Amino acid sequence: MADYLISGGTGYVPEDGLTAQQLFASADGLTYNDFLILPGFIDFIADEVDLTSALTRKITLKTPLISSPMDTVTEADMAIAMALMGGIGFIHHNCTPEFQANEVRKVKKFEQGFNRDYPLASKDSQKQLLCGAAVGTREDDKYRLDLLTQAGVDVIVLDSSQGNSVYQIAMVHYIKQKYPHLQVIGGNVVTAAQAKNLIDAGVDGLRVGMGCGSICITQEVMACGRPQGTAVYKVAEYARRFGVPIIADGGIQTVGHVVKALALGASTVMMGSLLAATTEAPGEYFFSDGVRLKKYRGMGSLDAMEKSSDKVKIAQGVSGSIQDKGSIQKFVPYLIAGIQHGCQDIGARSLSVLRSMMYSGELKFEKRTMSAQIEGGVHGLHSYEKRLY
Amino acid sequence: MADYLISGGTGYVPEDGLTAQQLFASADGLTYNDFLILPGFIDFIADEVDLTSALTRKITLKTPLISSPMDTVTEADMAIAMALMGGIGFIHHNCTPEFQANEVRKVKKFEQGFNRDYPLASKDSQKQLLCGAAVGTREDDKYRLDLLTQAGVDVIVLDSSQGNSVYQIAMVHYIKQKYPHLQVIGGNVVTAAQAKNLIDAGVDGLRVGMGCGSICITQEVMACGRPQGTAVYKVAEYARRFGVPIIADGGIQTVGHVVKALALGASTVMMGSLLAATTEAPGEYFFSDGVRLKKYRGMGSLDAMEKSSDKVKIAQGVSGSIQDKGSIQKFVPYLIAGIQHGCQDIGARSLSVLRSMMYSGELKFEKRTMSAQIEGGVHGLHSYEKRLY
Amino acid sequence: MADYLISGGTGYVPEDGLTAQQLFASADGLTYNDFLILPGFIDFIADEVDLTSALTRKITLKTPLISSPMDTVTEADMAIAMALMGGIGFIHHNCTPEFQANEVRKVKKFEQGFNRDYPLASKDSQKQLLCGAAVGTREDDKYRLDLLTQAGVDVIVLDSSQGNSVYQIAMVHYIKQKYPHLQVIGGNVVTAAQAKNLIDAGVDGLRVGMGCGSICITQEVMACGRPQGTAVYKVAEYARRFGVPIIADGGIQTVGHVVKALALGASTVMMGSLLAATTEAPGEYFFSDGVRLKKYRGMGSLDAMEKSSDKVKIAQGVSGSIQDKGSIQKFVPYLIAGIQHGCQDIGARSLSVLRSMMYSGELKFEKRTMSAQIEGGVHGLHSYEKRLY
Amino acid sequence: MADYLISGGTGYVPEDGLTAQQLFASADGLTYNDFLILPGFIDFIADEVDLTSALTRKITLKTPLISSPMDTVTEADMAIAMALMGGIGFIHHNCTPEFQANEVRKVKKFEQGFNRDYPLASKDSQKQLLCGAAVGTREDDKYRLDLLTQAGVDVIVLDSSQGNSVYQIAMVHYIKQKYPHLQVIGGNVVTAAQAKNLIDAGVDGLRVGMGCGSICITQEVMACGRPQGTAVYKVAEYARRFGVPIIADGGIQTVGHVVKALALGASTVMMGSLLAATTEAPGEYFFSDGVRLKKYRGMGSLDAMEKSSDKVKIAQGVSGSIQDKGSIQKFVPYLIAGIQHGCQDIGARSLSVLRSMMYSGELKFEKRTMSAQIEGGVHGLHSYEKRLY
Ligand SMILES: NC(=O)c1ccc[n+]([C@@H]2O[C@H](COP(=O)([O-])OP(=O)(O)OC[C@H]3O[C@@H](n4cnc5c(N)ncnc54)[C@H](O)[C@@H]3O)[C@@H](O)[C@H]2O)c1
Ligand SMILES: NC(=O)c1ccc[n+]([C@@H]2O[C@H](COP(=O)([O-])OP(=O)(O)OC[C@H]3O[C@@H](n4cnc5c(N)ncnc54)[C@H](O)[C@@H]3O)[C@@H](O)[C@H]2O)c1
Ligand SMILES: NC(=O)c1ccc[n+]([C@@H]2O[C@H](COP(=O)([O-])OP(=O)(O)OC[C@H]3O[C@@H](n4cnc5c(N)ncnc54)[C@H](O)[C@@H]3O)[C@@H](O)[C@H]2O)c1
Ligand SMILES: NC(=O)c1ccc[n+]([C@@H]2O[C@H](COP(=O)([O-])OP(=O)(O)OC[C@H]3O[C@@H](n4cnc5c(N)ncnc54)[C@H](O)[C@@H]3O)[C@@H](O)[C@H]2O)c1
Ligand SMILES: O=c1[nH]cnc2c1ncn2[C@@H]1O[C@H](COP(=O)(O)O)[C@@H](O)[C@H]1O
Ligand SMILES: O=c1[nH]cnc2c1ncn2[C@@H]1O[C@H](COP(=O)(O)O)[C@@H](O)[C@H]1O
Ligand SMILES: O=c1[nH]cnc2c1ncn2[C@@H]1O[C@H](COP(=O)(O)O)[C@@H](O)[C@H]1O
Ligand SMILES: O=c1[nH]cnc2c1ncn2[C@@H]1O[C@H](COP(=O)(O)O)[C@@H](O)[C@H]1O
């Protein structure tokens, strides 16, 4: 019985798999599809799994999930639904300042019932729903920010492809002195050197990803960006040294990508395309080839840039369509159950525990070859029907 | 004279290829498609090749092949046919306890003739066919297990996606105390750390693979699993230290995948999709686009979970169809002859010899690039017809 | 302020140094002099440090220190003194069976006072001092073992240069069936492959080291042995999987070697030359060139083999002398204070905690070049006097 | 109990240490002092160890030991004694042809008794002692070789610092056509490329080492040679492909160097300095500072090149003295017992088995750091006396 004397509270666990530190040592360009998380020990049911998540230094959500500040994803209906599910939405800024402040006002005034329960409903002190908003880094964004702070916005995201700029750092120093209470997320960043300049400017969170988004062409136009899994791991590991949470933003096609982003050190995950074409996503449904579709586009797509408007405009995103997904109040419970089940197979009873296992090297990972990615999908069938829930 | 003095019973063999230990040192995600086994020396005919296989610590099969405990693969007709061919079948548990015990009873009472010959017919002491059954890890599975042990079941498989759980370890300790004679296979596991907890619980065999199965989506939903060749090699090497055989389960598309699974240290191989849509697989044939198909589905697909029905259910598998393959009594002889010719090209006269050559580093392997996998398949033709036998 | 959300109970610690696994990855021949342990965090005084140590599966000492079964180190006076200090002594077997049983009898009958205090005095259930004895693997050792078990010996060490033998495994099986209460330490071993056979034979502890001891010539005579730090790490890691403690035996010149041996996974440390030429070490003091010396010799030295006696005898050790060190009741408190201060600088409040930090990767090491070993000694002085306490 | 089914005749052995192939992969300059052989499993007594050794393609000695063709080591008294002990001696050629043929004649005419027993006495078909002789690669060496073959010499060594020459290859072709029965050892070589040219010329054995010998200065004069352990391993591995045995020549200070040389693939070991200053070594004893010494010198030392004398001669060796060792009939039994005990600790019951274990990867090695070489010698004593037997 005296095994406790020879190694204390450890006990022997066979070594198998790679720590996150080893998984990224090779300096390949790993994205979420390129690796798996190895199963752990299960000693809890999947419903016990705590999804409590830092959005910023001060704001805590009960679900890691965020709707992206895009004009085809997040206006007040999306922000209300995401808050009720225990995430948040950032109202997009491809609209007039007064329009965006009116969308924020609708979220802050919602009250519910003015039929279901929302035990994760992600409220502020006054029992109003939490709301985020995007702003740019121009001089008009100072006026927009006056209106949004008057409308009771809880958190601001500085909304750029490349947040490591004098323009953004000046905007951070301006917000943190004029509205010291206001939580500011800087971004986008993909390197620790970008993250250090915004953390030194005093941001309360970071938004991580460049390229990677489903509608994005920044990598093939600008040559610039990073494989998103590697960016999330590198920026989360840097931001963690300063107590700064990160949002893994863009490239999330599946529940398994969400679990990978959280496991690599993201505190929250931001989705455009996964929440696009829901009932709460702005714009109308339409039929093309007998499929109920809704528009979805990059904010640096030409039609997104033509709205509300150096002579030649470089596209950084595409405009397209996503098939109807139903309602956020149906889809986000599927994401929550999928995340909890993923955490349960991993043996983490909490997302804070999941990241603690990753940084301690208790959590183990495994690379996938191309043939392993084929083997991990559906293969060898004549036909099949992938109904996820 | 001098050769024996200078190096004993060795003699010089040029070094070429990698040992299994070197093949997996790189920590890539190798699956079966990612590597080849190098040819050895042939000094026997392929019909000399002994396919004798440990299923558990106590049970030996004269052939390595197992039918998977799936409701579209293994009821009594499959289990009878697989036993007569010298494998075994595990009766699925997506049915009431009395139905599954009646399927087991039909296997144990079969006798043959109540006409081919079955010199590998895989029988117990009383000359009844061997039968396996699946059970879960709930409290109803204790009653199910009582009925199955009354029906004379020879071996139990504990049937989970992630067998390293308190629920499963408790079910192992319960079976081994109440039914000490009964052989228990634990699983599914893909890591040695999972394998150690079930081997310490006292399982008699392990079932290896998570993801990998043709109908499986656990990797894209849960983020969790392993490339199956790597999982088989790692878990077989760990389980071997304790005298525990392993079943390589799922991702077997070809005879070459079976030979690879056995070469990597699997004692037996379990198939769903390769034995699905045979005459003995449960369910009816049907025609769609002029092809004779039969249903094949994951046990964690939604329509499989609906049978005999936490409000939102997460799919871990798809539902689909496989093209008709004929009869087990035709197809399993093709698998046996294919395994024997593979062993003959390798220079192993037995599967025990094959694994001994692998652990001693006598058996050599070679990685395949993507261009080598293309080169290894059919290429450069206008059209062709792949008639396998 | 929610830093706990982003990484749970870990918290950020800069990475510096190597884990023990990395320190031995290079496959150099590291001994204790070849590496340092890096300092940790101090949150306790050195006297709080708990030195409770497993000698075997069942026996616990309150100090990690053992006197070696050598005829110039351990008879009853050494064994009494080492037990009173909270270690143990193994009575040597280079004597008649009746003489060794009489030495053991003197330890078991001691009582104290028939005046310092001994709060670590390392007693049995009946409040007698613990005593070990050595035996060989011949047929006369069965009679010797009968006398020693009648004399009330608590633990047996099987005393060979190379314990992985049929002769030794047979002696283990013989002891464990005839004397099932009796604790057996196997050895000497230096590889996990040797440790496997003795652990499978059923030893309760292992003695680790071959060559390495101050009087050793086994390496330049037999070509056979291992660098002792590497042997301790590799055998302790293997033995830990089975709950078997290890004794790091030989090559301990300093307190820092003891702290290194314990950090590398040794449960206890065995000393010959460090405890030789104390007042309790057998044999007389003598003067040569004006220095008070006592004889110290290997048990495979020719004069040690000439005592109590294939015509040509191979020496495996030398015969020599050590300068007088005083008394065990003065020297072992210096070793204890040195071990506790080493643990305090490391940041481990217990030896069980120290090994837990090492296996978990929290304890970091650092290799020393030859120039770093020079820099870590006394250097650049005209003269100096190294008074240790 | 079917553990044989899962891995055949292998059985599980924990991997620990390096195979010889891995030990030399790093391309350091390992000599014998730089590595250890790890202990194996002992299932035999050391006297069972068979030391039967190929000298050439045709000649077998019962002991691996050869006296070097040096004028301070091997004339007829040494060659007789080495043959009676079950090695051989090569009579040196720093003499006139008639003198060397008379030394060979005395060995071939010896008979014994014209009283110990010599069960290893290393005779030819006619029950005469085996004798070797050296020759050079000049035209006078053709006449010398006529006389030596008339005197009944059994084996010739071609005696050069650098055997990969037109002069030596011509001499090999000349011997093999004029005396087809006569066994020829080529050398010295240290690379496989040198070995390939002499093996293609048709030598029956190789002599391996350049520098390394105790009296060597070839490395600091010529810049040319190899670390002897590495040379033995490389040349033995190459020569083994053709069934050619190797002599490891020079740098043998200890029994452990002999066991290392044999384990690295040497079939026999050649000694100068270890057999110098024995009673059978040519030259007289003399006293200097009260020590009974005998001269020992390199054959390329100036005073060795003066005997039997562009104009400037380069020393390749030193002239010196060795302390008296006694008689070959006392010392060679110590070498034999030391080799057998080293083999017993390693777990090889034969030298053919030892080399088979090394090439198959079963024999494991371990590098020594400088601090491990210190720890492996005598350390931490005031004084000591190293009596070897
Ligand atoms: N994450 C991505 O990979 C990514 C890539 C492209 C676009 N987007 C999104 O599309 C939208 C537009 O992105 P963007 O980066 O093109 O917008 P942006 O306004 O940040 O940048 C456009 C250009 O204006 C410059 N700029 C910004 N503020 C300035 C100031 N005060 N003075 C002078 N120049 C200034 C920028 O450096 C850049 O050259 C945002 O919603 C953004 O998140 C995201
Ligand atoms: N590739 C694979 O290995 C794989 C992947 C997915 C599903 N499957 C198969 O699909 C079927 C279902 O797999 P599964 O893992 O979903 O079934 P499962 O019943 O093992 O697990 C379902 C859930 O219930 C939990 N659970 C199990 N026993 C419990 C108990 N007593 N109390 C409380 N909670 C308990 C589990 O931890 C898990 O959260 C099986 O046939 C399985 O083999 C296999
Ligand atoms: N550093 C070390 O670990 C080391 C090295 C050398 C010696 N020593 C010590 O010196 C002493 C002698 O060591 P040793 O290994 O020479 O003693 P030993 O008795 O274990 O071995 C001596 C020889 O006898 C053989 N032998 C042992 N039992 C036998 C049996 N029943 N039948 C036949 N042969 C048998 C062994 O295999 C070996 O060849 C011990 O105190 C030992 O601990 C220790
Ligand atoms: N460690 C060693 O291997 C080593 C090193 C130096 C010397 N030695 C020994 O010292 C002795 C002398 O060695 P050596 O190599 O100096 O002797 P050597 O006669 O082989 O070489 C001396 C020189 O003469 C040349 N030579 C040889 N045969 C020739 C021919 N027919 N025509 C023209 N040139 C020819 C050689 O190439 C070399 O330049 C030998 O006993 C040898 O084994 C050994
Ligand atoms: O026009 C664009 N080009 C590049 N990236 C964009 C653009 N518009 C939005 N993004 C990014 O894409 C993310 C959404 O990606 P998705 O979830 O994969 O669809 C957003 O949150 C932005 O970071
Ligand atoms: O619903 C499911 N999801 C994931 N894996 C499954 C599911 N049902 C069965 N499996 C696994 O898939 C294996 C069969 O894989 P196949 O032989 O490649 O078709 C089974 O034996 C199970 O381990
Ligand atoms: O004759 C011998 N040769 C080699 N090792 C020995 C011999 N006798 C004892 N030993 C070992 O040396 C250890 C003591 O080493 P020391 O503490 O460094 O002096 C003992 O416990 C034995 O393992
Ligand atoms: O003059 C010389 N220089 C260098 N090596 C020599 C010389 N003479 C003999 N040797 C080598 O030294 C070996 C003996 O080395 P030892 O046994 O270490 O003393 C001989 O067999 C030769 O290969």
Side-chain angles (χ1 to χ4, degrees), chain D residues 106-351:
Chain D
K106 285 185 289 185
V107 185
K108 299 307 299 178
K109 295 295 186 178
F110 179 73
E111 196 61 21
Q112 179 57 32
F114 299 82
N115 183 52
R116 285 172 284 211
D117 186 74
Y118 303 107
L120 309 166
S122 175
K123 294 181 176 67
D124 68 12
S125 298
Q126 288 83 18
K127 314 301 178 67
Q128 300 178 351
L129 296 178
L130 288 175
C131 193
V135 303
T137 53
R138 309 301 186 144
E139 304 307 321
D140 317 316
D141 294 293
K142 295 182 176 161
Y143 174 68
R144 180 181 298 270
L145 179 70
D146 288 18
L147 294 175
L148 294 166
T149 55
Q150 290 160 22
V153 83
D154 304 287
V155 54
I156 289 297
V157 67
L158 301 188
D159 182 38
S160 185
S161 59
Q162 215 293 52
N164 191 28
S165 67
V166 295
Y167 314 117
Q168 189 161 133
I169 291 166
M171 188 62 76
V172 178
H173 285 301
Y174 176 81
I175 303 197
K176 300 309 294 182
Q177 79 83 21
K178 189 172 177 74
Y179 310 97
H181 70 86
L182 188 64
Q183 297 286 276
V184 182
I185 298 165
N188 280 37
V189 302
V190 288
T191 84
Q194 295 178 291
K196 171 194 168 54
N197 278 353
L198 290 180
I199 290 175
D200 292 348
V203 302
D204 310 284
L206 290 170
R207 185 176 164 208
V208 180
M210 184 193 195
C212 81
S214 61
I215 43 58
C216 71
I217 61 168
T218 293
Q219 289 182 12
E220 61 259 56
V221 181
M222 305 305 183
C224 195
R226 200 170 197 182
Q228 174 65 333
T230 298
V232 165
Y233 178 67
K234 295 311 193 186
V235 181
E237 200 272 328
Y238 187 83
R240 170 175 172 247
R241 308 180 193 168
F242 304 91
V244 176
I246 83 151
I247 298 56
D249 175 22
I252 302 292
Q253 295 196 82
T254 70
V255 172
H257 296 176
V258 184
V259 177
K260 286 171 185 172
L262 296 169
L264 285 183
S267 299
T268 52
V269 176
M270 174 177 285
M271 296 166 290
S273 51
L274 215 70
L275 309 183
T278 60
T279 300
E280 303 82 351
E284 297 311 324
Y285 281 101
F286 72 73
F287 287 96
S288 293
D289 282 27
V291 179
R292 184 171 165 84
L293 299 163
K294 184 173 292 183
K295 293 300 185 72
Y296 179 63
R297 71 188 180 176
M299 292 286 274
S301 66
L302 292 182
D303 63 358
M305 295 185 300
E306 280 157 28
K307 196 171 186 290
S308 77
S309 65
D310 296 302
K311 184 175 172 65
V312 54
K313 267 166 307 203
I314 297 299
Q316 291 215 64
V318 301
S319 190
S321 51
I322 296 279
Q323 194 197 335
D324 164 68
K325 308 210 195 61
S327 170
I328 289 287
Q329 293 82 17
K330 298 291 180 68
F331 185 64
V332 173
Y334 162 74
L335 297 183
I336 289 166
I339 296 155
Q340 292 179 296
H341 283 78
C343 291
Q344 200 224 17
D345 285 353
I346 290 165
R349 68 175 48 246
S350 155
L351 297 178

Side-chain angles (χ1 to χ4, degrees), chain B residues 13 22 129 140 146 154 160 177 189 192 197 212 233 238 242 249 288 304 310 372:
Chain B
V13 184
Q22 289 160 21
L129 296 177
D140 312 313
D146 298 341
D154 303 287
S160 186
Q177 86 82 12
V189 301
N197 278 350
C212 80
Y233 178 66
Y238 187 83
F242 304 91
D249 175 22
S288 293
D310 297 302

Side-chain angles (χ1 to χ4, degrees), chain A residues 75-89:
Chain A
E75 286 176 4
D77 295 336
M78 178 66 72
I80 286 156
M82 291 298 295
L84 294 167
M85 295 293 95
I88 197 172

Side-chain angles (χ1 to χ4, degrees), chain C residues 181-193:
Chain C
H181 75 88
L182 190 63
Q183 296 288 277
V184 181
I185 297 165
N188 280 39
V189 301
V190 288
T191 82

Side-chain angles (χ1 to χ4, degrees), chain A residues 186-376:
Chain A
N188 281 40
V189 302
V190 288
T191 87
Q194 296 178 288
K196 171 194 168 54
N197 281 348
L198 291 178
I199 292 176
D200 292 348
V203 303
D204 307 282
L206 291 170
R207 185 177 164 208
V208 179
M210 184 195 195
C212 81
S214 61
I215 42 58
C216 178
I217 60 166
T218 293
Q219 288 183 12
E220 68 187 56
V221 180
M222 305 302 181
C224 195
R226 200 169 197 182
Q228 175 65 329
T230 298
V232 166
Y233 178 66
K234 295 311 193 186
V235 182
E237 189 278 310
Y238 190 84
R240 170 175 173 246
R241 309 181 189 166
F242 303 91
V244 177
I246 83 152
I247 302 142
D249 174 23
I252 303 292
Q253 300 196 76
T254 73
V255 173
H257 296 176
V258 182
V259 178
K260 286 170 185 173
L262 299 168
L264 292 185
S267 317
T268 52
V269 174
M270 173 176 285
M271 296 165 292
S273 51
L274 216 68
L275 309 183
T278 60
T279 300
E280 303 86 335
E284 298 311 324
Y285 282 101
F286 71 75
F287 287 95
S288 293
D289 282 27
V291 178
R292 185 171 167 84
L293 299 163
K294 184 173 292 183
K295 293 299 182 69
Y296 179 61
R297 71 184 179 182
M299 292 287 275
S301 70
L302 296 175
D303 47 299
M305 293 166 73
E306 286 158 29
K307 193 176 188 293
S308 78
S309 75
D310 284 331
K311 184 175 172 65
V312 61
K313 302 300 171 67
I314 301 302
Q316 289 202 69
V318 301
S319 193
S321 51
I322 296 285
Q323 195 197 334
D324 164 68
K325 308 210 195 60
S327 170
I328 292 298
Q329 293 82 17
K330 298 291 180 68
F331 185 65
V332 170
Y334 162 73
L335 297 183
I336 289 165
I339 297 156
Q340 292 179 295
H341 272 94
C343 292
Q344 201 225 17
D345 285 350
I346 288 166
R349 63 175 55 245
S350 156
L351 296 179
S352 305
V353 173
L354 178 68
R355 290 183 292 269
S356 89
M357 294 164 67
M358 184 271 300
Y359 291 117
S360 63
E362 174 176 357
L363 192 66
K364 298 296 205 298
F365 301 86
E366 179 84 49
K367 286 170 179 168
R368 292 212 286 182
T369 65
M370 276 308 115
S371 309
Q373 291 180 224
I374 291 158
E375 170 183 281

